[PDB]
C-alpha cells in the first residue's frame, strides 16, 4: 500500500439518514479539498477507490443552505452497501505525493465496536 491518510470521521445519525449526504468536518473540508461559499455550486465529482477495487463517484459541494460541505452521489449508496450506522468510522487516503484535482483518492471504513 502506498497511501497516505488524510483524515478519519465519526459517521453521525444524519450522514447514514433520508439526507443522503456525509458531512466533511470543515478542519479537513479547508485543507484537501478547492471549495468554499463563493465556488460555482455544484461542487466537484470525485472518485474513490475501496479496499476491493471499487470505484465509487461522489460529488463533493458546499451547501450554503446548511453551511457544510458535503459528499452525495454514491455516498448513500456507500452507506446501503456496508450498512453504516453512526459510530462506525469513515477514512479516506490518497496516493503518496498526490494533490489537487487529479488526486488518486481512497475511501475505507471500519464498523464498530469491534467483534
Same mark, same amino acid.
Given at each position: 500500500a502506498d497511501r497516505e491518510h488524510m483524515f478519519d470521521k465519526v459517521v453521525t445519525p444524519s450522514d447514514v439518514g433520508k439526507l443522503n449526504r456525509l458531512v466533511i468536518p470543515?478542519?479537513?473540508?479547508?485543507?484537501?479539498?478547492? /471549495? &468554499?461559499?463563493?465556488?460555482n455550486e455544484k461542487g466537484l465529482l470525485l472518485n474513490f477507490? &475501496? /479496499?476491493? =477495487?471499487k470505484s465509487w463517484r461522489?460529488?463533493?459541494?458546499y451547501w450554503n443552505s446548511s453551511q457544510s460541505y458535503v459528499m452525495t452521489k454514491g455516498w448513500s449508496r456507500f452507506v446501503k452497501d456496508k450498512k453504516l450506522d453512526a =459510530? &462506525?468510522?469513515v477514512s479516506f487516503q490518497r496516493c503518496? =505525493?498526490?494533490? =489537487?484535482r487529479d488526486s488518486r483518492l481512497f475511501?475505507?471504513?471500519r464498523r464498530r465496536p469491534k467483534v
Open positions: 470543515k478542519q479537513h473540508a479547508e485543507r484537501f479539498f478547492p /471549495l &468554499d461559499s463563493s465556488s477507490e &475501496d /479496499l476491493t =477495487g461522489f460529488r463533493y459541494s =459510530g &462506525d468510522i503518496v =505525493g498526490d494533490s =489537487g475511501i475505507d471504513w
